[PDB]
Amino acid sequence: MKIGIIGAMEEEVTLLRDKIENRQTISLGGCEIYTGQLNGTEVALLKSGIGKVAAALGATLLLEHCKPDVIINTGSAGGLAPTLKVGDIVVSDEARYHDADVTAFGYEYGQLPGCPAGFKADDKLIAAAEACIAELNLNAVRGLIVSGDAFINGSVGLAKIRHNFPQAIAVEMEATAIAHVCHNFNVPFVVVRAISDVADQQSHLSFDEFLAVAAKQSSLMVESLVQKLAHG
Amino acid sequence: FSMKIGIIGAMEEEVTLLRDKIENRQTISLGGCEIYTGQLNGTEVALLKSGIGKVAAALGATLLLEHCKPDVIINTGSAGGLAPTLKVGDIVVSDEARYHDADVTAFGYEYGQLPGCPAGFKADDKLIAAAEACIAELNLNAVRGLIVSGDAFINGSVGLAKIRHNFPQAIAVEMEATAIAHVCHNFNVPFVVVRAISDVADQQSHLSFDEFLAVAAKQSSLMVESLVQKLAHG
Ligand SMILES: Nc1ncnc2c(CN3C[C@H](CSCc4ccccc4)[C@@H](O)C3)c[nH]c12
Ligand SMILES: Nc1ncnc2c(CN3C[C@H](CSCc4ccccc4)[C@@H](O)C3)c[nH]c12
């Protein structure tokens, strides 16, 4: 069993990179993949870069060169669910683009042609993440995570997300692109991210202040998740 | 006699004319995409049908580069016209490509720019020069300039007005070119976009698109055919 892990930023993957033993680095298409073992479990950790295209490019390389069994997308997120606080965990049951619009041709808002309207996260991965959450006494929410190529900062951008996706629990920039690539290769995925901000007019300040905490929380969750998946 | 020209279009109607002209055609099926290998009037080509939108294009482009290692990439297909002098059927050639829907301006990046990327991706001078030569030789109407991409079909209202405000110099809008440019940038692969106008991205864009996609696909395909020939044999 080989678990794939994707994070956008150095800050989001560095704690995990530090823990990978028998570590090698694949440098390709402007991405880095760190292979080896995380607490005795085979992993391949991609630092993708920010945004949908970076993520898609990276995920494609990871799948092709490492052939992981499953994909875990980690990192920070803007919280949208009312009970989320900075540091809290969000688990995808599903990922959708909040910025895709071909509704003029009768696709669902956020759906692109040739894709499902949303991408369903894997039930077994979700169950394992929720067990870890319980064992670690974490505050978490499970639900729709929406992705776009914009940093959300209140105002019109937030209003548009609330309009189209009142049920969305968090917003970020890579998860759906990762889900989309996984869909095309029939690879199970889950998103396990931690809240850095709440996507409002204070989101820039909050993010600067709480990215470190979000990166730590998400990484600790991912470590626990990898362990649970490999060793029950 | 040793070059391989990569060509990318999103939709079947955009690649079908080119696909039909491929000698010794074969098909590679991978990651939900198709790549047609063979020769086009004697020049080795690899033609990708990527599907629609930024991720589809990125996934497709990555596979094409990894599996086929083309020397250059030509992005073909339709676009919404933004430049005044553009009519349906006319050619657009990219000088450069920017995301019209990327916004990390909150952290001081230029509008359209993603962190880790240049603010826009420049098309290859030689590729552009040859595209401009084919335009003269074919006696076509064309504009060269900035082409912008996003994951939305543009249909007037705020959608169009926002693009025109943020990119007053943009000459066309579509949904794959910048994703392709971005992937090519990361692999150090020269690209050019050579598309043809199907609509003017206004209230009427959906009707205009349905009506003039065939014309767009024809005119773009003709241009790519001449371009491949020019790149291969001067
Ligand atoms: N409010 C928000 N909107 C969109 N995404 C997020 C995220 C998740 N991220 C965090 C990452 C950074 S956003 C742009 C950026 C670039 C350089 C420095 C700081 C921030 C990007 O990979 C997506 C947290 N809060 C968000
Ligand atoms: N007004 C416009 N906005 C964005 N893109 C375009 C384009 C270029 N295309 C044409 C392609 C189709 S747009 C979405 C779509 C979906 C199903 C059926 C028809 C069109 C997509 O690859 C981007 C032409 N006019 C456009």
Give residue limits of the domains in chain A.
1-232
Cα–Cα dist B123/B97, whole Å: 8
Give B134's Cβ-side CA count (13 Å radius). Answer: 26
CATH pick for B1-234 out of 3.40.50.1580, 1.10.10.10, 3.40.50.2300, 3.40.50.300: 3.40.50.1580
- Residue B176 marked as a ligand binder: yes
Closest CA to B116 of A174, A76, A127, A122: A174
For ligand 2, whether the C-beta of B219 sits within 6 Å is no
Q: CB–CB of B201/B154 below 8 Å? A: yes
Compute the distance between CA of residue B76 and CA of residue B227 in angstroms, rounded to an integer. 11
Of A134, A154, A58, the closest CA to residue A91 belongs to: A134
Q: What count of Cα atoms within 13 Å lies in the side-chain half-sphere of residue B147?
A: 33
Contact A165, A108 (CB under 8 A): no
Cα–Cα distance for residue pair A124/A176, rounded to 1 Å = 19
Q: How far is the CA of A55 from the centre of ligand 2 (A)?
A: 23
Of B104, B186, B205, the CB nearest to A151: B104
Within 8 A of B106 by CB-CB distance, chain A residues are 151, 153, 203-204
User: Residue ranges of the alpha helices (H) in chain B?
Assistant: 12-20, 54-68, 125-138, 157-166, 177-186, 205-233
Largest CA distance in chain B: 51
B51 interfacial to chain A (CB closer than 8 Å): yes
Q: Is B14 a catalytic residue?
A: yes
- The 8 Å CB, 24+ separation contacts for A131-136 are A131/A228, A132/A221, A132/A224, A132/A225, A132/A228, A133/A89, A133/A91, A133/A221, A135/A224, A136/A220, A136/A221, A136/A224
Q: Which of A13, A31, A53, A98 to mutate to test the interface with B (most CBs of B within 10 A)?
A: A53
The Cα B39–Cα B33 span in angstroms is 20
Q: Is the beta carbon of B173 within 6 A of some atom in ligand 2?
A: yes
- Among the bound ligands, the one closest to the CA of B180: 2
- Axis crossing angle, helix B177-186 with helix B54-68, rounded to the nearest 10: 40
Q: How far is residue B150's CA from residue B92's CA, in Å, rounded to a whole number?
A: 17
Q: Do B153 and A102 touch (CB under 8 A)?
A: yes
How far, CA to CA in Å, does A119 sit from each of A108, A162, B42? 13, 19, 42
Q: Active-site positions of A?
A: 12, 197
Nearest Cα residue to A20 out of A226, A229, A228: A226
Superfamily (CATH) of domain A1-232: Nucleoside phosphorylase domain (3.40.50.1580)
Neighbours of A45 (CB within 10 A): 27
Distance of CA B223 to the CA centre of its chain: 12
Q: Is A114 annotated as a binding residue?
A: no
- Expressed in Å, this structure's resolution amounts to 2.0
Place of tokens 């990651």: B31
Q: Is B52 annotated as a binding residue?
A: no
With contact defined as beta carbons under 8 Å apart, do A193 and A76 qualify? yes
d(CA B73, CA B152): 23
- Residues 6 or more apart whose CB falls under 8 angstroms from that of B218 comprise B17, B196
